[PDB]
Amino acid sequence: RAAAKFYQEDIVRKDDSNGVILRCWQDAERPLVQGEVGVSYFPMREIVPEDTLELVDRLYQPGDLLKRSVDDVRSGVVTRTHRLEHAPGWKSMEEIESAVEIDMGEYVIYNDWVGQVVEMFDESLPELSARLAKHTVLAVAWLAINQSLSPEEAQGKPRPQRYWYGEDLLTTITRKAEEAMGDRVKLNDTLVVQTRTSVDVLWQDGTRETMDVKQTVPYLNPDEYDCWPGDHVLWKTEDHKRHVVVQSVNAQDRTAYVRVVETGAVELASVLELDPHGLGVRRGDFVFIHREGTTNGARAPMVPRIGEVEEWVREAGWRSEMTELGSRIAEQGDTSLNWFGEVLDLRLDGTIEVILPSADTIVVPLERLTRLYDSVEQPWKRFEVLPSAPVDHAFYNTPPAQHTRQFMARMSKEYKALQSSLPDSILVRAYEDRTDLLRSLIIGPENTPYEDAPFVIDWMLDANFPQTPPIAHFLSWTNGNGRVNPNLYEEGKVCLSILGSESWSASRSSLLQALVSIQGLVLVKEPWFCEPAYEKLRGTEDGIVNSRLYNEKAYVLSRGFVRRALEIPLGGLEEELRWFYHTSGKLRKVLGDARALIVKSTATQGDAEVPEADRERAVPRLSSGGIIALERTLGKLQALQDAQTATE
């Protein structure tokens, strides 16, 4: 047990009466300890434990996710966000206006174009680089054009002025998430803020209730299948990928009620069979508005981006010309702007509510929008040497590298090193006609979500091997839902340091140590922590729920590997797979242990008290929502065993 107290970007009150914001905690990319967080009090930055500071206010935004506690499976989305040094009491969010004229990166509008300010030139008491708390010169990098026009009108409007100064500066676009946030704002000559916040929360089960931020906890690491009411997701049944709109989600049962938009009816769906991820329209995204009849130019709910910054932004030349112009300066309602706006709210009836710059909220369909892309942040032998390489190999149709003369010396050593310490769970097959291609098969360890599951990797050695690491292509036998492991990509890339902390070296690294690393580091009991951004939460209390929701996902997709392994034939491993699953009786174990696991889950259908004896079991209890998808794979796994028993 190791609960986390303070989270990033909120405000914290240790000793004296008259706070601070913290930029570090248990989540780290100065290393921290099991209970200390970074901090930076400023009216210096120290590293104090969490036992000293106290919470005063937490910062949320319309679109962020939170829970009542880190153990509560139910999550919610924020819909709206609700003492100051003069350099009586408080002041509401509507009793103070931001006197900050222009900020770095704020969107502007001119003609029918839209851009962002990349550089500024303030002059107070010199003019340079800004970042001080009167801007004079602004450098705009115009992005896209208004999507509400005709090609004759589109080609007319060109790229406007790249530098703005003097009397030419208009339409300043505000964000409904940047208001009421150390800012400089007055109204009855400046006032600086030093706050109380409450957020209107929309829970997953449809319930909406407003609460204080001191009781809530941010949900920074959501599950890939987590959705919220109003979101446009994709219902991926094995028959077809249908478009549905989420209405309610029962995170405890891992089920959801979605409206099939082609049918208009609400049907119960398994959350594991919903693939939201980008596709949709998140709350707070700036989007264009097309015209009636005209669409987004896209297909089923997948609004496109329209960002297109010029190249002169990626340089650090142009700064000398902008600085020379700025130095010469100090010496001597309603409108037609209805084609742009940010996402305000997502209605349950599949309609998106857009707020125009003229404070005019409008409701538009998803197909009439276009997302904005700003600058942003951019019989069981372990080893054998088979004669011919299989045609189903990933690199069979890949030009073979020539290597050198001493390459066969290392391969002779690797072949022995494999045959020496290869466990009976990992199988390797080499080919003489293709000395550059290898194929491995790793059986999932015991008491893991990958228990008794096949994992085939096709290998290729570069012309510089062993100086270069072996190129591994993982055969991900998923139906396009997600990755069976955070490191094992669906595209085939195996994400490890051994195949690239340490690296690959011909002096220490080897093919044997790489295979046992994949079985030892990747295929573990809690594979959710294999993601590098989650490894800092080993056994911590705030990483318990996410490990359960992932081990369940890994256990369901692991059985799908047994489906494809017994369906499509693996070249050189066909007889090896039948000896394991059909001869030694492993398919009966996979079907049997899953059947007993489904039965034990229907007993404790309403009981949330996991038995203390079932602890450390990789997947102790099933969700009854993920069981819905497991019965589909088991139904095909049972049908293959039916044809096997009928053969004899």
Nearer to a second copy, 122 or 414 (CB): 414
Q: Could you tell me the end-to-end alpha-carbon distance of the chain, in angstroms, rounded to an integer?
A: 53
The least distance separating a second copy from the CB of residue 531, rounded to whole angstroms, comes to 15
Task: For 237-375, list the strands marked E by DSSP.
Answer: 241-250, 255-260, 265-270, 286-289, 340-346, 351-355, 361-365, 369-371
The least distance separating a second copy from the CB of residue 457, rounded to whole angstroms, comes to 12
The least distance separating a second copy from the CB of residue 465, rounded to whole angstroms, comes to 11
The least distance separating a second copy from the CB of residue 497, rounded to whole angstroms, comes to 11
Residues 24, 227, 495, 530: which is the catalytic one? Answer: 495
DSSP 100-154: ----TT-EEEETTEEEEEEEEEEB---B-S-----EEEEEEEEEEE-TTS-HHHH
Q: What is the CB neighbour count within 10 angstroms for residue 195?
A: 17
Closest CA to 46 of 11, 18, 77, 22: 22
Closest CA to 218 of 633, 454, 542: 542
Nearer to a second copy, 471 or 512 (CB): 471
Rounded CA separation 146/189 (Å): 39
The least distance separating a second copy from the CB of residue 412, rounded to whole angstroms, comes to 8
Q: Phi and psi of 632, rounded to 5°?
A: -75, -45
The residue ranges that bind a second copy (CB under 8 A) are 311, 314, 394-395, 397-402, 405, 409, 412, 416, 458, 462-464, 467-469, 471, 473, 489, 491-493, 500
The least distance separating a second copy from the CB of residue 314, rounded to whole angstroms, comes to 8
Is-contact 138 101, C-beta < 8 A?
no
The least distance separating a second copy from the CB of residue 242, rounded to whole angstroms, comes to 26
Rounded CA separation 12/3 (Å): 18
Q: Which helix (H) or strand (E) holds 640?
A: helix 626-647
In this structure, which amino acid lies at residue 17?
A: S
Nearer to a second copy, 15 or 311 (CB): 311
Q: Phi and psi of 208, rounded to 5°?
A: -120, 125
Nearer to a second copy, 297 or 539 (CB): 297
Quickly tell me which residue has 């003489």 as its tokens.
432
Structure tokens at 511: 């093919």
Quickly tell me which residue has 């931020």 as its tokens.
213
In this structure, which amino acid lies at residue 612?
A: E
Q: What does DSSP assign to residue 98?
A: B
Nearer to a second copy, 428 or 495 (CB): 495
Please indicate whether residue 495 is annotated as part of the active site: yes
Rounded CA separation 359/180 (Å): 17
Cα 626 to the chain's mean position, in Å?
A: 21
Q: What does DSSP assign to residue 94?
A: T
Catalytic positions: 495
